[PDB]
């Protein structure tokens with residue numbers, strides 16, 4: 518689970534919010550993207566190096582006007598792992614109040630297979646993106 | 662004539678505060694919808710100041 522999509526038309530009719538976190542860094546950009554049917558991110562598997570590598574970034578195809586753009590600092594995260602059960606939990610809360618896109622986050626270690634962790638955890642704010650756009654529907658972005 | 666500045670004149674509903682809309686679609690003033698770039702009872706959403 519890497520990123521999300523936010524917008525109201527998603528076909529270059531209006532503006533949309535792009536939030537992607539791939540193997541290099543987090544990118545936050547607002548353009549008039551042309552989202553295809555099934556946008557995702559592709560990662561090669563076992564290329565005789567005993568490791569993984571991302572090679573596909575099929576999310577959009579064009580951008581006429583961009584009002585916001587942000588690129589975080591680059592980092593190195595692993596793209597491998599094979600466990601019999603889930604190990605990490607990612608909780609997020611997104612709200613669009615008066616153009617402010619509040620983003621909350623919290624991480625906690627879990628040990629479950631196919632159930633939601635029953636418990637309690639507080640959520641802290643992380644960033645406030647003044648996108649000022651009209652959001653109606655969203656879509657997540659998974660890894661291949 | 663400085664017509665470089667445009668303003669929106671037709672809309673279906675009032676937008677929320679602190680919201681920016683760059684929609685350039687032809688507005689439908691009549692009961693019948695509009696298509697293409699022009700038409701009867703259709704108007705351009707932007708207009709230039711004098």
Ligand SMILES: *[C@@H]1O[C@H](CO)[C@@H](O[C@@H]2O[C@H](CO)[C@@H](O)[C@H](O)[C@H]2NC(C)=O)[C@H](O)[C@H]1NC(C)=O
Pocket residue numbers: 564565566570
């Ligand atoms: C180890 O990984 C590197 C890059 O992560 C591989 O190099 C790429 O290999 C593919 C396979 O055809 C090529 O299409 C790319 O052009 C190569 N990239 C570069 C920068 O050379 C490398 O092949 C992997 N090791 C082995 C043994 O396959």
Ligand SMILES: *[C@@H]1O[C@H](CO)[C@@H](O)[C@H](O)[C@H]1NC(C)=O
Pocket residue numbers: 537539540541542544571
């Ligand atoms: C995705 O990762 C590649 C390297 O694997 C990097 O070059 C690229 O900038 C990343 N994508 C974005 C949007 O930063």
Ligand SMILES: *[C@@H]1O[C@H](CO)[C@@H](O)[C@H](O)[C@H]1NC(C)=O
Pocket residue numbers: 581582683
């Ligand atoms: C969209 O692209 C066209 C052609 O590149 C350009 O003329 C137009 O100004 C762009 N839209 C906006 C809002 O600038």
Ligand SMILES: *[C@@H]1O[C@H](CO)[C@@H](O)[C@H](O)[C@H]1NC(C)=O
Pocket residue numbers: 525526651652653674675676677
């Ligand atoms: C936001 O988009 C939805 C769906 O396109 C629409 O129903 C609503 O009127 C829009 N609101 C504004 C303020 O543009």
